[PDB]
């Protein structure tokens, strides 16, 4: 308004100068950032002394002037000085104010209607508070603690994201007029944005603070700390008040934040799909990728794509690793040999060949690495630090707390190093059948011996006996391990050391881009294997909740419900741009041409034939009623259209529309067959399966011009077309052009025509036509 | 969205003096307060405001030709005195889905001598004893209540 | 005499349980109401009962 005119006058005055003009004319807008640093640069060494000296004065702060005049803030109440007309050297528009002035405002001053929005701004810390309040403390005890050092997360966070996925989110919720082009993360996560937008809209707020708080709300604070007991963010956030080196304040904190359940579900799904793709013989790679992209799952309220969560988590499991490898997702340098965990500290080497005779004379190749290399190893409640040297386990130290876990870790380590005579001459018990190739897929002798151990405890005992045994020398009695896993004995194993106190887990902030084979075995720029499908449980049955396996092979429904779902899908795919589609017809109010679509003609056979006319009447009625005015709900037409194909008739409609399979849908209420919500207006739930509706038009429920972006696209710039805003963008015609401003210092030309095709397929298929 | 944009959109270049109907359902109004309404709307005879986070009806301007109103899905409570002065020619009213506790809040509606039908559903008042009868004895001019007259006579379509 | 009294710390995280025969051994810990109802009868007690 008048303020706008003042801004224009100021811009004019500033351009009248020469230097300001040169700088606002030369270069791009990014220079602003640079200019933001050359100004207001001043620091202090010990702000503490300076603060005390400074606050001692009688008007130590600065403050706005007009805000005080408007706030009718006087210069005294009962004789205490509150501010004095004057000018700071830096701001030039601020006045020196007293500490007493702040107190004055809070006690009696300018009241505001409401302030509960704060609870949303700092939601993380109110969550901390609530989690604390729901704890039941317990006694306090004194003792020594085995605190192991390791990298963990201290901030419980749902839907952990990246940074590039945030810099955009902070705009569509706060600064939409200055928003950039729509990124994929937005189009995919629409309901999330809508939620974050519903709260911080039409409110008096400082927005920079909100953005900072949102960054914290989406940042898992990763720290390298000493830890004891279970590992959960709910605890690490207050570990300081649970136990130290000499004391422990017992307390139960198991039933809060429901975090690890999501991770175990994810890993179960990963295992399932990995096995599924393994069922194949030549395309398990593409099969797995398809299973991935053909799947989704629910998190709290929202539905997220699997491949998106997989690239955000950090669960180092032999399942997640494979998936993240297929999708080209980089990851850390962490190994996996069966259930155990491993990490290399130093050393090097290279592959080498050797052979062993299974029964009598049966040569079988097995490989082993060359020079000395250190490794840390982590099994359940047990740690170890060992060294391998030319097909032998040189030394090892342990700091666990259990005998069974100790023995299992030791055995798996011995295997990992091919130490012993068994790798020189396998036992009679094993045979060529147990060797490999369940159905053709070979197996290295390593995992063979692995399962041979997991089969019987006596195999493990014999394997341990393969390691040298001697008499426990004096003094080393404490640092010795028997066959049962006892901290001391009269005779103990060879080259072993024990101790109380776990080993400090190493650390490295490194990333690597690995690959995998057609047999589901990943490689890392070397012949080393980081993961496989033999190091995971064999199989198990589970009933996954709030998941969407939208793939034929990964489906249990029959042809009837599947046909209904596919008919709905096809009917939705006509929700794009261009004439002959439902949006253009709605705009033209041609409610009749919808009845003659081909998709309804393909879904008609599924309708109950003895009452198809009556239902048809009702459906057409609703459609006209919604179309003639303009007050329609897109989630009801897509539901009732399949019935408008036949001819109306007479009869009593009793509230429900039945198909030929004794499954109905009701016009207005959500059911198992067709459900949706105003929260997530971009999804349709049919028989549990989810369907993503494109964003071409926005009906009464949808919000803020974020529901038209999938209908627009970029085109060659045309200076003839007009320039408009982001709100009038809805009044354009399908197929028209218009110029527009995007983000900052950028103008482009858009056209309301979509392009459903992506680049994956086009790149993937075209690359397959070149390897011939 | 927002009642302002909704209104400006419904007004497809039409003056706010020749319309006979308006609808603003599935919108939002800051502080549950009307925004964009004036006395300019004179020929308006119908209104529909549903699920807009409304809480009070103080701001609504003077509308005489109005003869039907809908305020369901909101959380209005207490302000029914404003309806008499602003809209004295009203006949049909609906409040199902709002915060209504006692009858003292309903008493002002007696002055709407032009009132014929009222709709109270899902409110606390309905959970009382002798509520239909006591209401009828309070508002005698009224004939229909939630779609049913005395003796439970179902009302016609329209 | 029925089941004996029970002790507890402030926060109630710990709780001793004692029989009747030994309440004469911790008469100092018990609250005044129980204390004024137990001493005059200690004479008639033998091990855990009242004559």
mmCIF file of C-alpha atoms in Angstrom, chain A residues 113 197-199 201-202 631 678 699-704 727 731, chain B residues 1-2 5-6 8-10 12 23 25-28 30-31 51:
data_model
loop_
_atom_site.group_PDB
_atom_site.id
_atom_site.type_symbol
_atom_site.label_atom_id
_atom_site.label_comp_id
_atom_site.label_asym_id
_atom_site.label_seq_id
_atom_site.Cartn_x
_atom_site.Cartn_y
_atom_site.Cartn_z
ATOM 1 C CA UNK A 113 -5.129 -12.441 21.547
ATOM 2 C CA UNK A 197 1.067 -24.959 6.248
ATOM 3 C CA UNK A 198 -2.282 -25.125 8.073
ATOM 4 C CA UNK A 199 -0.694 -24.114 11.385
ATOM 5 C CA UNK A 201 -0.909 -19.504 8.153
ATOM 6 C CA UNK A 202 -2.740 -16.265 8.955
ATOM 7 C CA UNK A 631 -19.031 -27.009 -5.879
ATOM 8 C CA UNK A 678 -9.274 -34.098 3.617
ATOM 9 C CA UNK A 699 -11.668 -28.675 -5.721
ATOM 10 C CA UNK A 700 -13.111 -27.290 -2.416
ATOM 11 C CA UNK A 701 -10.852 -29.361 -0.051
ATOM 12 C CA UNK A 702 -7.430 -28.923 -1.788
ATOM 13 C CA UNK A 703 -5.277 -25.922 -0.776
ATOM 14 C CA UNK A 704 -3.086 -22.917 -1.939
ATOM 15 C CA UNK A 727 -3.236 -17.165 -7.599
ATOM 16 C CA UNK A 731 -8.018 -19.185 -14.433
ATOM 17 C CA UNK B 1 -8.602 -21.519 1.716
ATOM 18 C CA UNK B 2 -9.996 -18.195 2.968
ATOM 19 C CA UNK B 5 -10.727 -15.427 -1.882
ATOM 20 C CA UNK B 6 -13.728 -17.768 -1.884
ATOM 21 C CA UNK B 8 -14.105 -12.865 -4.647
ATOM 22 C CA UNK B 9 -14.157 -16.050 -6.732
ATOM 23 C CA UNK B 10 -17.885 -16.710 -6.375
ATOM 24 C CA UNK B 12 -17.634 -13.706 -11.156
ATOM 25 C CA UNK B 23 -22.053 -20.639 -0.240
ATOM 26 C CA UNK B 25 -18.492 -24.221 2.962
ATOM 27 C CA UNK B 26 -15.072 -25.821 3.448
ATOM 28 C CA UNK B 27 -13.282 -22.499 3.925
ATOM 29 C CA UNK B 28 -11.441 -20.762 6.768
ATOM 30 C CA UNK B 30 -9.423 -16.193 11.058
ATOM 31 C CA UNK B 31 -10.453 -16.143 14.728
ATOM 32 C CA UNK B 51 -16.922 -26.131 8.509
#
